[PDB]
Subunit: 428 residues, 3 copies
């Protein structure tokens, strides 16, 4: 009876998804034309609608509230170096992840724009007014006027003129939110009350999505089967999913075992092998716990005597960096976004490669600690490009492994960051 209320929600979700698979496992189609099929997937559209419900208030409130507490008077003049280090390592992680994913091409088994579109991004960086930036944005298009064709430019003008196209710009909002966030804090405590306003609304708006969770197991079984009845193919999906998982885990391992150890060796001038020999058991328990936040004291408990670390920094910046610095998570969103991009065969559009990368890096200050918290990060970045999020569930049916894959590298990242900062402090 006690175990009934411990982890019931996950059991209900997995039972629902397997029941939906079994219902799709009926005889082949038993279906009429699209008239019957379309209205049999109604709750899935309903679930996506309720997920799109709160994309705006969360991104507009929680980001500002988080930016309000940032830059704590710069009490550590050498602390901003750590912030830049976190930013650059997240950037490099995202870049290598997307490059490797494009190299392996997972999910690809089964009117043009010139390269001068970058300025359009810069134009979408700053909306004309806030209200317009909520549903539609700016985009250029080339048309021929035959104005210079009269003399020497026959049959081709390529005159660029910008029009309005639906879809909001989360990119066009995050910078304004950050500017406002630093603004209402810089002037002093006289505008302090506004912070006490905003830092409430997030707590007021997050709770409701938990109730949305209570509906998730019901909806999923409706659209998973609704996806498999008409495909009639099972090998393609499982092969694509396996390739995606293999690519993601390979990227995580390659990042964790390579990128930061070189930087550590650059300034340590010693053996990184000696570092982790006394840390084998904390690493194992972090791998097993599936939640790096729970095993936080283990890192300090071991490295306090195993490694020549300081006492202040060991208990000063690590709690802060364990929530803001997420490493494998960004890899997860990147490999998921490119995965759906390859399923939908949309485009390469390096201009969009920059925007997805920057959104992934900027959203690394969002949900953390709780397992599978990056689903909202995936949703918002998918909304930033306007792709149908109806393929979302198939990514968290296997998250119970990518969680172990990502938490260990996420904690190792800021662990070695604290170590290299300790070494820097040893150099005075």
């Amino acid at each position: 009876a006690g175990f009934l209320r411990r982890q019931a929600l996950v059991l209900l979700t997995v039972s629902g998804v397997l029941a939906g698979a079994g219902l799709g496992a009926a005889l082949r189609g038993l279906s009429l034309s699209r008239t019957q099929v379309t209205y049999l997937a109604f709750p899935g559209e309903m679930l996506l609608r309720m997920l799109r419900m709160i994309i705006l208030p969360l991104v507009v409130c929680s980001l500002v509230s988080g930016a309000a507490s940032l830059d704590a008077s710069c009490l550590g003049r050498l602390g901003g170096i750590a912030v830049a280090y976190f930013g650059l390592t997240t950037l490099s992680a995202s870049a290598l992840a997307v490059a490797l994913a494009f190299i392996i091409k997972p999910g690809s088994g089964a009117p043009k724009e010139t390269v001068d579109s970058f300025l359009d991004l810069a134009r979408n960086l700053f909306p004309s007014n806030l209200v317009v930036a909520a549903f539609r944005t700016y985009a250029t298009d080339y048309k021929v006027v035959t104005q210079n064709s009269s003399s020497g430019n026959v049959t081709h003008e390529k005159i660029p003129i910008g029009t309005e196209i639906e879809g909001m710009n989360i990119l066009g909002l995050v910078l304004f939110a950050l500017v406002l966030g630093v603004a209402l804090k810089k002037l002093g405590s006289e505008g302090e009350d506004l912070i006490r306003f905003f830092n409430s609304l997030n707590e007021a708006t997050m709770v409701l999505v938990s109730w949305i969770m209570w509906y998730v197991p019901v909806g999923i079984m409706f659209l998973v089967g609704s996806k498999i009845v008409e495909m009639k193919d099972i090998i393609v999906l499982v092969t694509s999913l396996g390739k995606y998982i293999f690519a993601s885990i390979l990227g995580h391992v390659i990042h964790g075992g390579i990128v930061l150890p070189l930087i550590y060796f650059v300034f340590t001038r010693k053996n990184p092998f000696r570092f982790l020999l006394g840390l084998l058991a904390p690493f194992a328990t972090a791998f097993a716990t599936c939640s790096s936040s729970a095993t936080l004291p283990s890192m300090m408990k071991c490295i306090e005597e195993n490694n020549g670390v300081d006492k202040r920094i060991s208990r000063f910046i690590l709690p802060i960096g364990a929530t803001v610095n997420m490493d494998g998570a960004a890899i997860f969103q990147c490999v998921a976004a490119v995965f759906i991009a390859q399923l939908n065969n949309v485009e390469l559009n390096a201009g969009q490669i920059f925007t997805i990368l920057v959104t992934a890096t900027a959203s690394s200050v969002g949900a953390a600690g709780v397992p599978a918290g990056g689903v909202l990060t995936i949703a918002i970045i998918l909304e930033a490009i306007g792709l149908p999020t109806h393929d979302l569930p198939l990514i968290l049916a296997v998250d119970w492994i990518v969680d172990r894959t990502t938490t260990v590298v996420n904690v190792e990242g800021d662990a070695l960051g604290a170590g290299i900062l300790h070494h820097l402090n040893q150099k005075a």
Copy 2:
């Protein structure tokens, strides 16, 4: 001199409307083409514009503020039964009122959609984002694609696809407002300040409409005559109005004398005739006072000794239920909405029958106590369907009788509700 400032506003309004009627009572038309007529009704459009001014802030603020104070810790575990009773009796009242009005058909003397449109309502129940839901909503339409016509579906596809059509969705907003209202109260006193915010704005936004009242007598005389000059018929209007009033009063009497006494007899097992014999004078003074709130102490003063009632409940829930539970008012809005619907010959559209009914039931927590407070309820429900509200004045030129008709049944409703709750408590 003292009587000059007592009830001057009503005298000014009635003098203005009769003066406008007299100005329309000039020789038959004395009019040029529509060019002259259209710009001679300008202030009426101005009055409607100023009424549409504050439809959004009131409905978005007062509803949330009211929902914040709801569910007072459920201190009476048997109290929610009374809330359900009020909801069901209001629902039954609205249903019987609209059914009887459709039976009698008042005002009817002088591209098609299939029955599967209900889901569209459900789709409008949840907007994609709040900003879009302020001016336009979703609606499906059938078009032919001739995709299956190549084989066996010739000349007909009936493919449904949804488009955007102007007009907001008050239905698509009230549920979100209620959810937010329960949300900012459930988490605790830490978000309490937000309530102290909202419960201010209503008091800040209601006062101004009183100033709007100061303009009402001026505007009405402009458009009443502007309505009667071109019709040239007087019998139709008066006959329709008389039929409407007769239907409304018959519905009120039928509800009051029938629907609740049966429920009372079900659980009382005694004579309802003995109940009201000692209450004849309080009923008469409630009928004469035209304001049930003023005669509130009379109910308790009589039933304290005339009927075997309890002492706690007699002074505990009645003040609360005298403001939220309105009975004849809902009948009034229903019979008015169907009346303008029959004048305009729009449609039956049972799907709209559900939405008008649910809006009427949900708005029963709005303005109360003050006479003729339901005019805003009529306005908002008319806006919910997008009908021209230019026919509003003719409904409150006779409200001085429907007020007496409705207040007596409104007070008798929760009076007998308190009585049946007392009987339930007698059964322990």
Copy 3:
């Protein structure tokens, strides 16, 4: 070194603009087709975008905050007369300025609507809902229906019907803001907290535009040269600018030396020449200081003994009137608006003459004290008509003279106002 940080920003701006002029002073065009020219003016469009960024929050917050502190309990029953005097003198100033500018016609050297469009303004005075009034408004158009052409109205109906056209209505918002501002103050201190909200946001939103100033010198040099390369004419621009400056200074002098002295003589019945003979040095130092706020004590220090003034009013209303009452500033915005209107050859449209005048008068309660504070006033009134603000810089390259021209008359205005109020108080 100390002088480096005193007035560095103005030096940087002027150096940037002269460098941009020198870069445009290269050999004649050295240019390819419009394809190259258009993308070489990108930062100018960027600067205009960042200026349009904060037009809405400032106008919606600062105006309400200012209106909240207005009408300080009417402690001086004769004080509202001064408010009406300020309003009427600003109105007369704007009227004479625009009339003289239209007479001189500066900058003019190098589908129709009937006169019944005034009601359209009144229709735009009150928007249907706040959200729609943020990007598009109402405007009528005449079309032919040939409905009465069948009998006697052949070939012409002129039926007016209103459609929606992009562009917001600042006029359609300021009155609502003022009404809300008086509303949340009239009900009492219970809604006081809301004021403490609004009067914060302005202080939160003004600071950021200072940072925008830090970018102004960089951007200007890009589009000034981009304006002069393709014109190839220098005489027209300098002649137009000189004519504009001469007209503005003539209008300022004519107003200051004429309009108010007559009113003073009407109620003083004495010699105005005797008034300013002892004030010659304060006037000179006000002319030299370029900032009337700095020389505020000089006025009272001289007129305390030179003129028979009272003691209370001399230090009671003058600090308040030195910030709200701006005189030459309104002349400046009027002559600038008409100047760009004549450059663009748009229209006369007396209906727009009323709206520009009323916006200029209402915005006279905005930025004051700081030199060249009226640039935002020019920007908002230009946005009210939807004209391209790309010609903004050329107006503040010479403001270093109009500042002296306008501050002296601005201070003389309320100085003589205080004098005439003192004379009125002498009459009891």
